[PDB]
């Protein structure tokens, strides 16, 4: 069962938002925590992906690129399991010190996107998603977005992604019934990802004025890589069209 042994052995721990939970729910303080959370949770993807089954098979620029793009989609997906598993999907469990309530959902001005995330979190439920199914969908999520001109080696990449399906396909395996659903969920992700990608970007521009603090690396990714996606340069690979 070697493939699985790895996903869990590499699987990150609990990251904290490092949040002064005493300060009342201000749009600035909330989002100046999510930015650190983005940052911290990014460090952890950097490390997690580096250790993936045949990740160093890819080009080093491609490695960075795929991480830089995926970063969001993953954080969302993982976050939704976090909420699902820890709060039974009642609230948004970003970190231990940053669980999002209706009022906090509202106070970050991210309400719609949170409805979406409570939603997909609700899906782990309604779909009896196994951890070994979750883990696999998350690994595969890294390979779910590329530039349209293609990677420094698309070949070695397509190779990688293709074997991450056969893997989930083996983890599932009238199996086709299940398959669909999971590929469906794995799509619901990108739509949302792109919404935060847009939310985050709006913010970065006006952050000077809304008093919301982006870490150096946060701003950079949002300033240089996220625009690629938003500008349609970089598009995610959906299973079904849509």
């Amino acid at each position: 069962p070697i493939f699985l042994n790895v996903l869990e052995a590499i699987e990150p721990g609990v990251v904290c938002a490092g949040h002064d939970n005493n300060q009342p729910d201000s749009f600035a303080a909330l989002l100046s925590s999510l930015n650190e959370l983005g940052e911290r949770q990014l460090v952890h993807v950097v490390k997690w992906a580096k250790a993936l089954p045949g990740f160093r098979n890819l080009h080093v620029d491609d490695q960075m690129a795929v991480i830089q793009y995926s970063w969001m989609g993953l954080m969302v997906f993982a976050m939704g399991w976090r909420s699902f598993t820890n709060v039974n999907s009642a609230m948004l469990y970003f970190a231990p010190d940053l669980v999002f309530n209706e009022y906090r959902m509202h106070k970050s001005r991210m309400y719609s996107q949170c409805v979406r995330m409570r939603h997909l979190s609700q899906e782990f439920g309604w779909l009896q998603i196994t951890p070994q199914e979750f883990l696999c969908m998350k690994a595969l999520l890294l390979f779910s977005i590329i530039p349209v001109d293609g990677l420094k080696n698309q070949k070695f990449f397509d190779e990688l992604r293709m074997n991450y399906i056969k893997e989930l396909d083996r983890i599932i395996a009238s199996c086709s019934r299940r398959f669909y659903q999971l590929t469906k969920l794995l799509d619901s992700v990108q739509p949302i990802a792109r919404e935060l990608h847009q939310f985050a970007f709006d913010l970065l521009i006006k952050s000077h004025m809304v008093s919301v603090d982006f870490p150096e690396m946060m701003a950079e990714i949002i300033s240089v890589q996220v625009p690629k996606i938003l500008s349609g340069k970089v598009k995610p690979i959906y299973f079904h069209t849509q």
């Binding site: 460090v43 950097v46 080093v60 490695q63 960075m64 830089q68 150096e216 690396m217 950079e220 990714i221 240089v224």
Partner: peptide
């Protein structure tokens, strides 16, 4: 910038 630096630590 700072990401590629994080990719050699």
């Amino acid at each position: 910038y700072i990401f590629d630096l994080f990719y050699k630590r």
